[PDB]
Structures are given as structure tokens and as C-alpha cells.
Design a protein around this ligand. Structure first.
Ligand SMILES: *[C@@H]1O[C@H](CO)[C@@H](O[C@@H]2O[C@H](CO)[C@@H](O)[C@H](O)[C@H]2NC(C)=O)[C@H](O)[C@H]1NC(C)=O
Ligand SMILES: *[C@@H]1O[C@H](CO)[C@@H](O[C@@H]2O[C@H](CO)[C@@H](O)[C@H](O)[C@H]2NC(C)=O)[C@H](O)[C@H]1NC(C)=O
Ligand code: NAG
Lengths: 50, 50
């Protein structure tokens, strides 16, 4: 299918209306970041020639 | 099949037709002695960086 970016949300804009929150959600989200890799050392002489 | 290694006793039970043993990386880490049908692990020698 042709993908859909998101659901349409026509914001009810007017020159004299505001939307004020009456409540809140404490949301905890995960962010995973790689820091290091496996430290590898190669004996060049042994690898090429044994 | 030639190489250099430390030959220790192995707990791997080979099937009767199999002679050598390989790990994921296709390196010979297990072998069967031709004279006496026993399985030996081939641990690579302790190479290291000084
Ligand atoms: C603030 O008021 C506007 C209009 O009075 C609301 O917008 C409508 O929302 C309904 C519900 O989805 C839609 O069917 C209408 O098409 C919207 N109209 C317009 C002009 O956008 C809006 O939802 C209200 N805001 C809140 C928080 O209730
Ligand atoms: C704001 O939202 C919270 C939930 O995020 C509401 O707390 C719930 O309130 C109802 C009715 O009082 C209870 O049945 C739920 O068990 C409550 N949930 C939790 C997690 O405590 C709270 O009432 C809302 N406040 C307003 C003013 O709308
Ligand atoms: C080969 O010689 C060894 C000598 O110890 C003997 O034990 C063995 O039975 C012989 N035969 C085979 C098939 O290994």
C-alpha cells in the first residue's frame, strides 16, 4: 500500500480560543544508546602467516 | 591435517563417521585420533600481546 504519514488532525484554530490542559500524564520513555564495542586485537603476523 | 595446538581430553561424542570438529568460524577445534578412537579438543596456543 501507499503509506500514511499519520492520522489527520485539523486543529480548531481561531483568533480568540485557547486550549488549556486540565490534567497530566507522567510518561517514562526508554532511550537506548550504544557506548562501546568489543575491543579486538589482531596479531597480523599470525593471522597472515601462522 | 596439520596445525599447532594444545590437545586436551574432549567430552564431545563424535558420530563414528566423523573425524574432525569445527566451531562456528570453521576452525578445527576437535579431532579424532586415528590410532585410538578418542576425541581430543584442540585449544589454540596462548598467543598474546606483550
Ligand atoms: C474546541 O472547539 C472546536 C470547535 O467548537 C472543536 O473542534 C471540533 O472537534 C470535533 C470533534 O472531533 C470535530 O468533529 C469538529 O470537526 C471540530 N471542529 C473544528 C472547527 O475543528 C474542538 O474539539 C474543541 N476542543 C476541545 C478540547 O474540546
Ligand atoms: C487526572 O488523571 C488521573 C489519571 O491519570 C485521574 O486519576 C484517576 O481518577 C479516577 C477517578 O477519580 C480513578 O478511578 C483512577 O483510579 C485514577 N487513576 C490513577 C492512576 O490514580 C484523575 O482523577 C484526573 N483528574 C482530573 C481532575 O481529571
Ligand atoms: C589400531 O592399533 C591400535 C593399537 O593400540 C589398536 O588398539 C586398534 O584396535 C587398531 N585398530 C583400529 C581400527 O584403530
Amino acid at each position: 500500500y501507499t503509506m500514511s504519514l499519520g492520522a489527520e488532525n485539523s486543529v480548531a484554530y481561531s483568533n480568540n480560543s485557547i486550549a488549556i490542559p486540565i490534567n497530566f500524564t507522567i510518561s517514562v520513555t526508554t532511550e537506548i544508546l550504544p557506548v562501546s564495542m568489543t575491543k579486538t586485537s589482531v596479531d597480523c603476523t599470525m593471522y597472515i602467516c601462522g | 591435517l596439520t596445525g599447532t595446538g594444545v590437545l586436551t581430553e574432549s567430552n564431545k561424542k563424535f558420530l563414528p563417521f566423523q573425524q574432525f570438529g569445527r566451531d562456528i568460524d570453521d576452525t578445527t577445534d576437535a579431532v579424532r585420533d586415528p590410532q585410538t578412537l578418542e576425541i581430543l579438543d584442540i585449544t589454540p596456543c596462548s598467543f598474546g600481546g606483550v
